[PDB]
Structures are given as structure tokens and as C-alpha cells.
From a paper:
Unexpectedly, Ghcol binds to two peptides at each of three binding sites, which are present in the active site (a) and in the activator subdomains, Act1 (b) and Act2 (c). All the bound tripeptides exhibited the same conformation as the Pro-Pro-Gly units in collagen. Notably, the Hyp side chains form more hydrogen bonds than those of Pro in all three binding sites. Tyr555 is involved in hydrogen bonding with OE1 atom of Glu520 both in the ligand-free and ligand-bound Ghcols (2.8 Å), and Tyr564 forms a hydrogen bond with O atom of Hyp in the ligand-bound Ghcol. The OH groups of Tyr476 and Tyr480 form water-mediated hydrogen bonds with OXT of Hyp at P3’. However, as shown in Figure 4, the binding of tripeptides does not significantly change the structure of the Ghcol active site.
It produces the collagenase Ghcol, which consists of 767 amino acid residues with a single catalytic domain containing the zinc-binding motif H492EYVH496. Here, we report the crystal structures of ligand-free and Gly-Pro-hydroxyproline (Hyp)-complexed Ghcol at 2.2 and 2.4 Å resolution, respectively. These structures revealed that the activator and peptidase domains in Ghcol form a saddle-shaped structure with one zinc ion and four calcium ions.
Residue numbers in the entry:
A (entry chain E), C (entry chain F): 1 to 6
B (entry chain A): 90 to 622
Write the structure that this text describes.
């Protein structure tokens, strides 16, 4: 899925 | 001064934006994993629409130099798509994404989009990532082609630019699950041209940007699945140039192997005459040989003689210690001829992640791996694969040397049949005995996981799987359960082993499920003592 | 499984 936090 | 996560739990779009611009990007981070009361409030479809419209007009005003506020605004937005995906209580309405695309478009169309600079790259990073979090990969192939074309040694000086522009490859990866992208990717000949030139630039080899060269090669290899599309010749032509310019092992092999990984999967190796590159790669990469004994052989990338000897002597120490702790009588299980072990040691985790995949066909998202083969096959020689690391144990400095080696011993003297044979879960035992024999009582993390308030029961340990790779549950609680049983019930351990040494997985499961009923009291008490002293 | 993300 969508990229996590940096 | 400090992050106030509660300020985001409001119905006021105005107050939400005040929290974003004041608390800054480092506090918006908390929204990724916040309570679903925080997430449901902070990511209402109105909030996303209003934040997006303010972000769009602010981004039209951007004048270069970076921007803490835009950085936090695009982070907030893409955090929403993260929250929509993982939280079932959140679904965005039809008009959210076209507003987010308006916000992203304003940054892309701004005169400063292709600026060089650390601060500018910090906001550009969030923008590139939002293109992916938000399902817009089909909308920005032109930007990918532009960044690939403009990228030069000056942009490369800045970590944040490398980090930001590396995002376009994740955009090509993520577009696989985007039907507008798959319906469109097949006509993108400018993109394929640019991916080729970027990957084939030799000045990237041995640079801080070699990983981007390798990601370009990998994503070009993905495009070889579109076997009849208009790009097929230029993808193929470009993959053949990568394979011909760079070596399979050596300077730039990251680019060669990146392309080989995806082009082999989504196409056929014979299209590029790279079929069977793995054998020559295995010889080139594990080019040393060191014979410990007539039963253990090391192949290594680059070890000193002093390391080889220390590894050989440490494996001999663990062998006799294993056999007295496990009461094997040195008698193997039946149908097992694995007398000889082969030990494969790469120079680092980096090398392991590059080479062990193609050579041994394993996944490298871990700290080493044991491969039993078929013990019943006459001539079978099992392998374990490991890497050197500075945190590994002296004097050999091989990460998990003793851990993987106990897997070899465990599989030959405790566990009947090859690795897949059991019809019940044995993860807790394999990883537990491997941790317990190699570490005995020196395991500060296993102690740590008792004190932190989160524990597991014997029943829960025994049913552990590799799914999700819960390192804490697998290795630390595997360790504690095996250690507890050995200290307080070594009789019971031998009865369980009597089943596993013969392959009676039903009786084995029966035995340990009894333990989980009775000894849960003992275990819970015994683990609190460890947290005491 | 298939090849993973960059
Ligand atoms: Ca949802
Ligand atoms: Ca070395
Ligand atoms: Ca076995
Ligand atoms: Ca814990
Ligand atoms: Zn293991």
C-alpha cells in the first residue's frame, strides 16, 4: 500500500 | 516546542491547518499511527479537500528555497491516503483525489519544480511520494521522464534530492496496481529512453547515486512484461545494453543485477543471453575456499585467514555443546546423509542482498538462511548463507554463524525429514533451539521483552509463524520458551524430541499443547524471575 | 513471489 512515514 | 497530536482531532479545517503549519512535518508524522479517533477526525473527506485547496494555492506562490509548510501539507495529505488504506473507518469521497491532484499539479507546474537544493528537495520528496500514495502514477510519467533527463552531478550532491528523485522509481513500481497506468505505460517511449540513459551512465558507478542507477535498471526490467507494446524494442534494446556494459560481478553489478532480477521474472533470460548467470556469479562472488574439517567447508567473498579459523573453531565448539545439550548420542535421524555442510559467507548484508537471491534462490530480507536440501538424497550437501558484520561475534565476525549452524545440527539430529516435512508448526522450536544453544543465557533483548509489558503465553509461542516476520515473537519468545523448558523440564524436552526425531508431528503437537496448559503458571513465574535478576 | 519495490 501507500508509502509509510519518512 | 512539542507535538500536540490532539490539535489534529478537530472538525475545523482552519485549526487543522494551523496545527500543520505550526507543529511542522515532524509532528504530522504521528498521524500515520495515531488512534483511529485521531485518524477519523484528522482525515475527514472535507479536511482532505480543504487542506488540498489551500496547499494548491500556497504552492502556486512558491518561490524556491524549500518550504516547511508545504513540506508538512503534502505530508499530511499523503498520510491521509495511508490512513484511508489501513483504517477501515476511513473512505474518501469521489472529489478528494482530484483536489489532491490539483495541489500536486501546482508544485509540478511551478517554475521552481526542477530547482536544485536540499530544502527544496525536502518538499519535492513529499510531492513525489504523494503522487504514489494517492494513485496518480498515471498522471506524472512526464515528470519522471523529466527528472531522469535533467538529473546531473550537481543535483546528486544533495541527499534530499537523491532521496526525492529516487521516488520516481517507486512511482513506476506502484503504477502496477493502477489501471490508468497499465493501460498507458505501453506507449511511453520517451520514458524508456530516459530510463536507459540514466541506468547506462557510467559516472554513477561507485557513486552515492549508484542505487538510483540500479533502481532505473530494475524498473526498466519490469517493463519487459509488456511484450507486444510499442516500447518492447526499446525496453529490450536498453536491457541488452545494460547487460553488455556492466559486469555480473564487480563495479556496477548492482545495475546489472537490478535489471536481471526483473527482466528474468517478467520475461525470459534467453532473450538477453543471461541464462544461468548464477553459476559464474557464485564462483566470482564466493571465490575463497577454506576447509575446516572433512565435514565443514566455507566459501567466502573476502575473509581473512584469522576469521576462517575462528569460524571453524567456533563451529566445532558449538557442535559438541549442541550434542550434549540435546542428548543426541551423535545419532542422526533416519534417512539423513547430511554429513557435510557448506558455509557461504558474503562480505556484508549489502552483498548478501545482491547475490544470495540469484545464487541460492532465497529471500534476503533477513539475517541469514539455512537450506537443508533433501537429507535422504545420497550426495546432498546442505548450505547456510550468512554475512560479515561489525556487530557480529569475534573473532570470526560472521552474523548468525552459530545461529545458522545450529539449524544444520537441529535439522539433522532433531527434525525428521527435509524442512517442509512437518505438518505442525515448529517455528518456535527451530528458532528457539538455534537461539538458546548459540546464546545460552546471554540474551539482553529476550530479557528486555519481558519487562516492556508485552508478553506471550506458551500456547501463543507454540503457534508462532513466520508471517509478518515478528522478530520479537519468533526469536526472543522462541528463545525464552526453549530455555524455560530446558531449565525446568529437560525430561519433557526429550519426549517431544522422540516424536520430532521420528516425524510424529501429531504426537509432537499433542505433547507441547499439554505443556501450554499446565506449565503456563511456571513459565509466567519463571519469566518474571528473569526480569528480576 | 514477485520482485519487490525499489
Ligand atoms: Ca479505509
Ligand atoms: Ca570481509
Ligand atoms: Ca531433518
Ligand atoms: Ca515484549
Ligand atoms: Zn533461524
Amino acid at each position: 500500500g501507500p508509502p509509510g512515514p519518512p | 516546542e512539542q507535538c500536540d497530536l490532539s490539535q489534529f482531532q478537530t472538525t475545523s479545517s482552519n485549526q487543522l491547518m494551523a496545527a500543520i503549519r505550526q507543529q511542522g512535518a515532524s509532528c504530522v508524522n504521528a498521524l500515520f499511527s495515531a488512534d483511529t479517533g485521531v485518524q477519523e477526525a484528522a482525515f475527514s473527506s472535507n479536511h482532505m479537500y480543504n487542506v488540498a485547496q489551500y496547499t494548491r494555492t500556497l504552492a502556486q506562490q512558491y518561490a524556491g528555497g524549500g518550504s516547511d509548510e508545504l513540506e508538512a501539507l503534502y505530508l499530511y495529505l499523503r498520510a491521509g491516503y495511508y490512513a484511508e488504506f489501513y483504517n477501515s473507518n476511513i473512505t474518501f469521497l469521489s472529489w478528494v483525489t482530484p483536489a489532491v491532484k490539483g495541489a500536486v499539479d501546482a508544485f509540478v507546474q511551478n517554475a521552481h519544480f526542477y530547482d536544485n537544493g536540499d530544502a527544496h528537495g525536502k518538499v519535492l520528496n513529499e510531492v513525489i511520494i504523494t503522487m504514489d500514495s494517492a494513485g496518480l502514477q498515471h498522471a506524472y510519467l512526464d515528470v519522471v521522464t523529466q527528472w531522469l533527463t535533467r538529473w546531473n552531478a550537481q543535483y546528486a550532491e544533495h541527499w534530499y534530492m537523491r532521496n526525492a528523485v529516487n521516488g520516481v522509481f517507486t512511482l513506476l513500481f506502484g503504477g502496477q496496481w493502477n489501471n490508468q497506468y497499465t493501460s498507458l505505460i505501453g506507449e511511453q517511449t520517451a520514458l524508456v529512453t530516459a530510463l536507459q540513459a540514466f541506468a547506462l551512465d557510467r559516472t554513477k558507478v561507485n557513486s552515492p547515486t549508484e542505487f538510483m542507477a540500479a533502481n532505473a535498471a530494475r524498473e526498466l526490467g519490469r517493463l519487459a512484461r509488456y511484450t507486444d507494446a510499442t516500447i518492447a524494442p526499446k525496453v529490450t534494446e536498453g536491457l541488452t545494453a545494460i547487460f553488455g556494459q556492466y559486469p555480473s560481478y564487480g563495479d556496477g553489478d548492482a545495475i546489472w543485477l537490478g535489471a536481471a532480477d526483473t527482466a528474468s521474472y517478467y520475461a525470459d533470460c534467453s532473450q538477453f543471453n543471461i541464462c544461468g548467470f548464477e553459476d559464474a556469479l557464485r564462483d566470482a562472488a564466493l571465490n575463497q575456499t577454506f576447509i575446516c574439517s572433512d565435514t565443514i567447508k566455507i566459501r567466502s567473498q573476502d575473509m581473512s585467514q584469522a576469521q576462517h579459523l575462528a569460524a571453524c573453531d567456533k563451529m566445532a565448539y558449538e557442535e559438541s555443546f549442541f550434542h550434549t545439550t540435546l542428548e543426541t548420542g551423535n545419532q542422526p535421524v533416519a534417512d539423513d546423509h547430511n554429513t557435510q555442510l557448506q558455509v557461504n559467507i558474503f562480505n556484508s548484508d549489502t552483498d548478501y542482498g545482491k547475490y544470495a537471491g540469484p545464487i541460492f534462490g532465497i529471500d534476503t530480507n533477513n539475517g541469514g538462511m539455512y537450506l537443508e536440501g533433501n537429507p535422504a538424497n545420497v550426495g546432498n550437501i546442505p548450505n547456510f548463507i550468512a554475512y560479515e558484520a561489525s556487530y557480529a561475534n569475534p573473532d570470526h565476525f560472521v552474523w548468525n554463524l552459530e545461529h545458522e549452524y545450529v539449524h544444520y545440527l537441529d535439522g539433522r539430529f532433531n527434525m525428521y525429514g527435509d524442512f517442509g516435512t512437518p505438518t505442525e508448526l515448529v517455528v518456535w522450536w527451530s528458532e528457539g533451539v538455534a537461539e538458546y544453544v548459540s546464546r545460552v543465557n546471554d540474551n539482553p533483548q529476550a530479557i528486555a521483552t519481558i519487562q516492556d509489558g508485552s508478553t506471550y503465553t506458551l500456547a501463543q509461542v507454540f503457534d508462532t509463524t513466520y508471517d509478518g516476520f515478528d522478530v520479537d515473537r519468533i526469536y526472543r519468545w522462541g528463545y525464552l520458551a526453549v530455555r524455560f523448558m530446558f531449565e525446568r523440564h529437560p525430561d519433557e524436552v526429550q519426549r517431544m524430541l522422540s516424536a520430532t526425531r521420528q516425524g510424529r508431528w501429531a504426537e509432537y503437537k499433542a505433547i507441547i499443547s499439554g505443556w501450554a496448559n499446565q506449565y503456563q503458571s511456571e513459565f509466567a513465574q519463571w519469566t518474571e524471575a528473569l526480569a528480576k535478576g
